[PDB]
Design an enzyme around this catalytic site. Structure first.
Site, PDB file in Angstrom:
ATOM      1  CG  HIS A  23      -0.393   0.047   2.533  1.00  0.00           C
ATOM      2  ND1 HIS A  23       0.478   1.036   2.939  1.00  0.00           N
ATOM      3  CD2 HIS A  23      -0.578  -0.750   3.612  1.00  0.00           C
ATOM      4  CE1 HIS A  23       0.827   0.829   4.197  1.00  0.00           C
ATOM      5  NE2 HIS A  23       0.198  -0.249   4.629  1.00  0.00           N
TER       6      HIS A  23
ATOM      7  N   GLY B  16       3.523   6.094  10.333  1.00  0.00           N
ATOM      8  CA  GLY B  16       4.837   5.890   9.759  1.00  0.00           C
ATOM      9  C   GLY B  16       5.505   4.580  10.117  1.00  0.00           C
TER      10      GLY B  16
ATOM     11  CB  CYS C 178       3.293   0.740   7.316  1.00  0.00           C
ATOM     12  SG  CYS C 178       1.652   1.171   7.927  1.00  0.00           S
TER      13      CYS C 178
HETATM   14  O1  LIG Z   1      -4.446   1.591   0.613  1.00  0.00           O
HETATM   15  C1  LIG Z   1      -4.411   0.972   1.679  1.00  0.00           C
HETATM   16  C2  LIG Z   1      -3.801   1.492   2.899  1.00  0.00           C
HETATM   17  C3  LIG Z   1      -3.109   2.716   2.867  1.00  0.00           C
HETATM   18  C4  LIG Z   1      -2.512   3.264   3.981  1.00  0.00           C
HETATM   19  C5  LIG Z   1      -2.569   2.602   5.236  1.00  0.00           C
HETATM   20  N1  LIG Z   1      -1.977   3.139   6.362  1.00  0.00           N
HETATM   21  C6  LIG Z   1      -0.632   3.727   6.269  1.00  0.00           C
HETATM   22  C7  LIG Z   1      -0.382   4.742   7.381  1.00  0.00           C
HETATM   23  N2  LIG Z   1      -0.710   4.182   8.695  1.00  0.00           N
HETATM   24  C8  LIG Z   1       0.208   4.172   9.682  1.00  0.00           C
HETATM   25  O2  LIG Z   1       1.360   4.620   9.571  1.00  0.00           O
HETATM   26  C9  LIG Z   1      -0.185   3.592  11.017  1.00  0.00           C
HETATM   27  N3  LIG Z   1      -0.812   4.503  11.829  1.00  0.00           N
HETATM   28  C10 LIG Z   1      -1.269   4.218  13.095  1.00  0.00           C
HETATM   29  O3  LIG Z   1      -1.825   5.054  13.797  1.00  0.00           O
HETATM   30  N4  LIG Z   1      -1.044   2.915  13.494  1.00  0.00           N
HETATM   31  C11 LIG Z   1      -0.421   1.912  12.751  1.00  0.00           C
HETATM   32  O4  LIG Z   1      -0.283   0.783  13.230  1.00  0.00           O
HETATM   33  C12 LIG Z   1       0.023   2.318  11.429  1.00  0.00           C
HETATM   34  C13 LIG Z   1      -2.083   3.673   8.766  1.00  0.00           C
HETATM   35  C14 LIG Z   1      -2.302   2.610   7.699  1.00  0.00           C
HETATM   36  C15 LIG Z   1      -3.263   1.366   5.290  1.00  0.00           C
HETATM   37  C16 LIG Z   1      -3.849   0.849   4.149  1.00  0.00           C
HETATM   38 CL1  LIG Z   1      -4.691  -0.697   4.307  1.00  0.00          CL
END
Ligand SMILES: O=Cc1ccc(N2CCN(C(=O)C3=NC(=O)NC(=O)C3)CC2)cc1Cl
Ligand SMILES: O=Cc1ccc(N2CCN(C(=O)C3=NC(=O)NC(=O)C3)CC2)cc1Cl
EC number: 3.4.19.12
Lengths: 306, 306
Positions: free
Chosen positions: A41, A143, A145
């Site tokens: 993603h 951030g 992921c």
């Molecule tokens: O297109 C699909 C898609 C796109 C983006 C996405 N995100 C990325 C940024 N995120 C983070 O960095 C987190 N932020 C938090 O607060 N907690 C965490 O554990 C991780 C959220 C998820 C998820 C999906 Cl599925």
């Protein structure tokens, strides 16, 4: 003596963490040999998150859309492909700090260490368990992921988890390193819910053995029960049923303490039906289920790693 | 018109099946490019099955202990390694009939075709679902290990299952093609039990839509329910709860029949509380849960494959 939530030393993994940027989106990647692994993603914009079409999104990218940085050194992307929910970025330089490694898929109830990272730089390490509902109770901010979970067996790092998202209830979901999700989750930003969690019974018993080894004995008694009588009580308190395989796994702890597994189950049965009456076990007022039998042996017998 | 338990055409997979012999043990392998994949318990004798130590057993083998036959042609093994519960045998000849393929891990409730094989020769093909307890209700006799499950998407074969063992209850357990077991099972010949199975609710609803498309309408009614009211009844009958994601998946079937998902749920609620009163649906007197929404669309809309 003592008992702590102990993680594996993270050094071998810290040298594999990189920063991956695609457009205005930045997250962490894992650099082993000449491949960088990261959540797919990273190629999504705000317009795509609700219902991404990853095949279309990927064909519209070229190698130069991917900026990979290992600290200061920039890595040149010479190829890209998608394996399930993981993006594989071929780079021109093989990681000289690549440890001996393998990709394993773990089972609910098993534990692993998480190296939480931001912008490719390691921030902290902690231990957690894969819950029966295939989520983990992690600690992740924006951030994070691409942060990875791992165990160390001898000189070999077993990678078992890559972080993808946080669910609405504040728990966390991800994939193995082949890109296959743990649990019935998909990498779309829709509202997905985890199933009901249960308590990992074999882990609670291992932790009670750790307590006995460290001198906490107030909860023991002379009674004994059967596997069927215990499981009848356990099901009522949302505890996983206990198998003969679990009993065998606890063997080394039963031998070291001289307390049979079925004896310890009778103590657990009492703690479930009467509570702990304001007393503590190993500094906790709740029953702890995120130490495996192997974790207890490692910390109460002292295994190291090369 | 009509509705059948339909499997994928097996031709692309039949050309990849080989026979693997190690000692007095023979089973099936999957030959893609220059690698043969097979269950690692092919290296076990009767003395090892109860508690095998696969690392020790494998180091005591050499390449010439492995006899691989593709029909009449013998394949020369030039290397071997273990990836989780799968043995990977490097051979000197790349399979010229290797199709476009990928390795995917499927989710409970999804369906796939099984090519049952004996001595490397295909015997039959059938369709089954991965059950919520991570077993499959297959049809396998002695010598069937290494048979594979697969889906066909366009011109690409997605391998999702390799057969390893039969449990005491007569159901079957195996791994994905990376060697990671589906469910909490291990490749030892000990007594392992599967958890309680549940009925795959979204699949039952898809099958009711297939019935309407084929003219079975006696179970419909004018009522409607909510997702929460339905799930309250479903849990009492050991049915998987229904999510908004499931509702969306059934969209194409609701549009084609003009019957809203929540309308169909009210019909299902009635069938659970009153039975079918000696009537049948699509030639069955029970509710069928091994057709996905995609299976129904494929068979009631006619998708082919190249
Ligand atoms: O297109 C699909 C898609 C796109 C983006 C996405 N995100 C990325 C940024 N995120 C983070 O960095 C987190 N932020 C938090 O607060 N907690 C965490 O554990 C991780 C959220 C998820 C998820 C999906 Cl599925
Ligand atoms: O060392 C570990 C080990 C060794 C052998 C083993 N078996 C191989 C032979 N078997 C068959 O060919 C089947 N016979 C049936 O009747 N049904 C089937 O589905 C398959 C049984 C399993 C399993 C393990 Cl775990």
């Amino acid at each position: 003596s003592g008992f702590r939530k102990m993680a594996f030393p993270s050094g071998k993994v810290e040298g594999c963490m990189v920063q991956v940027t695609c457009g205005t989106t930045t997250l962490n990647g894992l650099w082993l040999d000449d491949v960088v692994y990261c959540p797919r993603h990273v190629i999504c914009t705000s317009e795509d998150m609700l219902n991404p079409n990853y095949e279309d999104l990927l064909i519209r990218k070229s190698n130069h859309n991917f900026l990979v940085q290992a600290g200061n050194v920039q890595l040149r992307v010479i190829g890209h492909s998608m394996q399930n929910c993981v993006l594989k970025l071929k780079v021109d330089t093989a990681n000289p700090k690549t440890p001996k490694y393998k990709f394993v898929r773990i089972q609910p109830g098993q534990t692993f260490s998480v190296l939480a990272c931001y912008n490719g730089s390691p921030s902290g390490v902690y231990q957690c368990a894969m819950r029966p509902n295939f989520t983990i109770k992690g600690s992740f901010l924006n951030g994070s992921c691409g942060s990875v979970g791992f165990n160390i067996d001898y000189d070999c790092v077993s990678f078992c988890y890559m972080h993808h998202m946080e669910l609405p209830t504040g728990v966390h979901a991800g994939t193995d390193l082949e890109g296959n999700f743990y649990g019935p989750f998909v990498d779309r930003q829709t509202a997905q819910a985890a199933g009901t969690d249960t308590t990992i019974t074999v882990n609670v018993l291992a932790w009670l053995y750790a307590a006995v080894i460290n001198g906490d004995r107030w909860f023991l008694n002379r009674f004994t029960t059967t596997l069927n009588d215990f499981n009848l009580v356990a099901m009522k308190y949302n505890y996983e049923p206990l198998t003969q395989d679990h009993v065998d796994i606890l063997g080394p702890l039963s031998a070291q303490t001289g307390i049979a597994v079925l004896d310890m189950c009778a103590s657990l049965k009492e703690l479930l039906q009467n509570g702990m009456n304001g007393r503590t076990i190993l500094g906790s007022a709740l029953l702890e289920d995120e130490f495996t039998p192997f974790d207890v042996v490692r910390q109460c017998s002292g295994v190291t790693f090369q």
